[PDB]
Amino acid sequence: PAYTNSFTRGVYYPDKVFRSSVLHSTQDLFLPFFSNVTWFHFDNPVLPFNDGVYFASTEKSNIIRGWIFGTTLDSKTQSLLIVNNATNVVIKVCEFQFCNDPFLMESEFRVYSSANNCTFEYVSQPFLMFKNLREFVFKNIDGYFKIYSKHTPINLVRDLPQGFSALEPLVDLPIGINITRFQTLLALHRGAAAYYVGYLQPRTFLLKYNENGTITDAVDCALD
Amino acid sequence: GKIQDSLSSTASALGKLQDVVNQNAQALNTLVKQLSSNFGAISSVLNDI
Amino acid sequence: NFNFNGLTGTGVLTESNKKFLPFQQFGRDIADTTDAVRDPQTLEILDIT
Numbered sequence: 330p331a332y333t334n335s336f337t338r339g340v341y342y343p344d345k346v347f348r349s350s351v352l353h354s355t356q357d358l359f360l361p362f363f364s365n366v367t368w369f370h371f372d373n374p375v376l377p378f379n380d381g382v383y384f385a386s387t388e389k390s391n392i393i394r395g396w397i398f399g400t401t402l403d404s405k406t407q408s409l410l411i412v413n414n415a416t417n418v419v420i421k422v423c424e425f426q427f428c429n430d431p432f433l434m435e436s437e438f439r440v441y442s443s444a445n446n447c448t449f450e451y452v453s454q455p456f457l458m459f460k461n462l463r464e465f466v467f468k469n470i471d472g473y474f475k476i477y478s479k480h481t482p483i484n485l486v487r488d489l490p491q492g493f494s495a496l497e498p499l500v501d502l503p504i505g506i507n508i509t510r511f512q513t514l515l516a517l518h519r520g521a522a523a524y525y526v527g528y529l530q531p532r533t534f535l536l537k538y539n540e541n542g543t544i545t546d547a548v549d550c551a552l553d
Numbered sequence: 554g555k556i557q558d559s560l561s562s563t564a565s566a567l568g569k570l571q572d573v574v575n576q577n578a579q580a581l582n583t584l585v586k587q588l589s590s591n592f593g594a595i596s597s598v599l600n601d602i
Numbered sequence: 603n604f605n606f607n608g609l610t611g612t613g614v615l616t617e618s619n620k621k622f623l624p625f626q627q628f629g630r631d632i633a634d635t636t637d638a639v640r641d642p643q644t645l646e647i648l649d650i651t
């Protein structure tokens with residue numbers, strides 16, 4: 330429902346390789362150009378992973394403050410969770426439970442289900458506080474989970490503007506679990522905030538690096 | 554007078570003399586991509602073996 | 603005769619004019635051999651010739 334035309338954004342670095350002034354082609358798991366994303370907005374239903382998720386919360390948003398990842402979302406299969414407390418990020422690879430709509434003198438700490446059976450933790454800097462557009466790319470291939478963001482100000486708060494956005498690796502995380510279905514986090518402060526979900530599959534891109542060696546333009550195969 | 558002018562902006566008659574560097578150059582270049590070929594061995598560089 | 607994270611090899615090492623990503627280790631050629639590395643225990647970036 331509510332098929333929104335996701336135009337161009339969603340390209341990312343594979344990995345090692347600095348080059349410059351090159352016209353080079355790669356082959357990984359990719360998000361389609363001109364694809365449709367169901368618009369979301371109060372309302373936050375459940376989503377599956379389906380081998381790759383392009384998360385993009387809207388600008389003029391201060392609501393989404395974390396994520397719950399997993400396969401079953403039970404106390405059996407190892408789960409994953411990140412929380413920004415406005416000065417750090419709190420990565421939990423612990424075991425958790427079910428909460429239908431957790432959220433955040435402004436109140437917090439309602440969100441947590443259970444803190445038993447932890448496997449891994451990580452602490453780093455917070456990501457970032459007409460706004461710098463939050464974008465995230467989620468994938469796990471045999472353990473290595475990765476972080477991607479490129480935050481850019483524009484108008485047109487709901488609909489995605491055109492342009493170009495390479496996705497830059499931030500935290501590579503070798504966990505080694507399964508991910509099939511997940512849920513983001515919200516913050517009910519007494520509420521329809523927008524975000525988008527993408528999908529990856531092995532299509533074929535074509536990359537161009539500039540003289541600085543940064544992606545500026547890219548095309549795919551099955552478009553035309 | 555016209556013989557520089559037909560060849561001034563871009564004539565369609567440079568052609569054979571331009572690509573004869575170029576198809577040679579990719580023939581050089583397609584020899585270079587074969588270094589990164591693998592042939593069922595588990596590497597391309599010798600040092601990984 | 604270098605050895606960076608197990609990749610042996612031979613060449614002359616020099617400081618990089620390149621700008622390296624910050625998430626990275628190996629710059630690789632059309633020939634599919636290493637051209638630019640980052641030190642396994644330093645943050646400096648070295649061009650391999």
Ligand SMILES: *[C@@H]1O[C@H](CO)[C@@H](O)[C@H](O)[C@H]1NC(C)=O
Pocket residue numbers: 332364365
């Ligand atoms: C995306 O949605 C629009 C409008 O619903 C539709 O016209 C278009 O065919 C959809 N894209 C694909 C690939 O089906």
Ligand SMILES: *[C@@H]1O[C@H](CO)[C@@H](O)[C@H](O)[C@H]1NC(C)=O
Pocket residue numbers: 424446
């Ligand atoms: C945590 O989960 C793992 C699953 O591999 C299990 O082996 C272990 O016994 C669990 N520990 C506790 C304290 O429940």
Ligand SMILES: *[C@@H]1O[C@H](CO)[C@@H](O)[C@H](O)[C@H]1NC(C)=O
Pocket residue numbers: 400505506507
């Ligand atoms: C994923 O596949 C199944 C459950 O989906 C399980 O056997 C396997 O351990 C999982 N992979 C991991 C976490 O190594």
Ligand SMILES: *[C@@H]1O[C@H](CO)[C@@H](O)[C@H](O)[C@H]1NC(C)=O
Pocket residue numbers: 539540541
């Ligand atoms: C590379 O980035 C620098 C920093 O802004 C800029 O001055 C330079 O023009 C860029 N290179 C090109 C080819 O635009």
Ligand SMILES: *[C@@H]1O[C@H](CO)[C@@H](O)[C@H](O)[C@H]1NC(C)=O
Pocket residue numbers: 643644
């Ligand atoms: C290894 O040496 C490097 C120096 O660059 C340092 O980063 C690391 O902490 C050292 N490890 C030790 C002393 O085991």
